[PDB]
Structures are given as C-alpha cells and as structure tokens.
DNA sequence: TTGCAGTGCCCACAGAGGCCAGCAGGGGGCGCTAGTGAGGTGGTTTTTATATGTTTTGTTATGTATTGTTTATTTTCCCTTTAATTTTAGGATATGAAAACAAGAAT
C-alpha cells in the first residue's frame, strides 16, 4: 500500500482522470452519469456537487450576501477573486 | 462572467504498532530442620576356664582262717591161751507112804 499511499489511488472507468479520494470518485461519476439530486430551495436549479451549490442557495437568496471587499494596494479597487488581486497588485 | 469537471489542502478520527507495566511459566541455588540409620564405645555379666581343697578310689600289708600232711595215739580186727562156767553121770539124802504092829472097840 506504500505504492498507493499519497498517489492517484482511484482510477475512473469512463475516463483516465484519477483522484486520491473515493468521495472524488462519486462526484466525478455523477458528471458522466447525470444524477444532480441537489436542489436550491428557492429556484429550479439542480446541482451536481455538494454544499458549494448549497452556498449558491444561501447567497442567491440571502440579502446578507456581503461581498468581501478584499482591497488591493494603492489603487484600492475591489475584485471578487483572489487571483485577480494578486495579478493586478503585482503591477499596482 | 458562470456551470461544470476536476484538483488542493486542512483537519481529524481511526488504525495501527511500538512502548510499557503486569504477571505467569520453568528452573537454579540456598536457610534450616525432624527423623532415622548406623557405627563406635562403655558397661555388664557371663561364661569359659583355671586352680585349690576335699574326698573317693585304688593299692598294699598284716592277721585270721582254712586245707592239707605226716605222725600218733586209738581202735579194732584177728589169732592162741587160759578161767570161769556149763553139762552129764553117780552117790547120797529125805520125806513120803505103804506096811506091819500094837491098841481100843465091838460082837
Ligand atoms: Zn470519468
Ligand atoms: Zn437558488
Ligand atoms: Zn490596485
């Protein structure tokens, strides 16, 4: 098992992607064989993956969405994604 | 910019295996003692053995009694010669008993 320890332990039958964890195999499988049994309580949307889209539910319906400012350096403009702040800060 | 498909990372509870005290297995070496077992020494008696005294046994000498021996005085058997003692005539006695005589008595 030291061969399999901290490696791509679980192969996928349909495609050659591999993940270390089983949970990843169940989520990966649902994309190939569409089950999407997770459903926002306020809209029609049916989600494949777990509570990240339950976070969809939360935010799409909660007026307390509160987008984290995440202010940069001197210019100070706000962006919703970390990679954007790092790239624009490198030359700001 | 988002949904979708696929990846990264952080945690955490399991899982795992070395760490550790606890504890039980077989075996080595000592502390100490009850209880015989045997061996050696001392005492006792005892038993054999030895020596002394008394008595019993064996041997020797003297006296008495028994058997034998040639005398030796009976003694006893056998002669020839007397000394009573007996037997046989031969004469004499005696005492009896007739016989004769004499004396009474009778006829
Ligand atoms: Zn696949
Ligand atoms: Zn919704
Ligand atoms: Zn800036």
Swiss-Prot record:
Ubiquitous. Absent in primary spermatocytes. Coiled coil: none annotated. It is found in: Nucleus, Nucleoplasm; Chromosome; Chromosome, Centromere. A zinc finger (C2H2-type) spans 10-32, 38-61, 70-92. The 11 zinc fingers are highly conserved among vertebrates, exhibiting almost identical amino acid sequences. Different subsets or combination of individual zinc fingers gives the ability to CTCF to recognize multiple DNA target sites. Belongs to the CTCF zinc-finger protein family. More than 13'00 CTCF-binding sites in potential insulators were identified in the human genome. Interacts with CHD8. Interacts with LLPH. Interacts with CENPE. Interacts with BRD2; promoting BRD2 recruitment to chromatin. Chromatin binding factor that binds to DNA sequence specific sites and regulates the 3D structure of chromatin. Binds together strands of DNA, thus forming chromatin loops, and anchors DNA to cellular structures, such as the nuclear lamina. Defines the boundaries between active and heterochromatic DNA via binding to chromatin insulators, thereby preventing interaction between promoter and nearby enhancers and silencers. Plays a critical role in the epigenetic regulation. Participates in the allele-specific gene expression at the imprinted IGF2/H19 gene locus. It is linked to Intellectual developmental disorder, autosomal dominant 21: A disorder characterized by significantly below average general intellectual functioning associated with impairments in adaptive behavior and manifested during the developmental period. Additional MRD21 features include short stature, microcephaly, and developmental delay. This is Transcriptional repressor CTCF. It comes from Homo sapiens. The chain holds residues 486 to 577 of 727 of the full protein.
């Amino acid at each position: 098992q030291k061969s399999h320890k901290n490696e791509k332990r679980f192969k996928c039958d349909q495609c050659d992607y591999a993940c270390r964890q089983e949970r990843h195999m169940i989520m990966h499988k649902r994309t190939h064989t569409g089950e999407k049994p997770y459903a926002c309580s306020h809209c029609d949307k049916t989600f494949r993956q777990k509570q990240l889209l339950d976070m969809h539910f939360k935010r799409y319906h909660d007026p307390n969405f509160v987008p984290a400012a995440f202010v940069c350096s001197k210019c100070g403009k706000t962006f919703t994604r970390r990679n954007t702040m790092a790239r624009h800060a490198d030359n700001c």
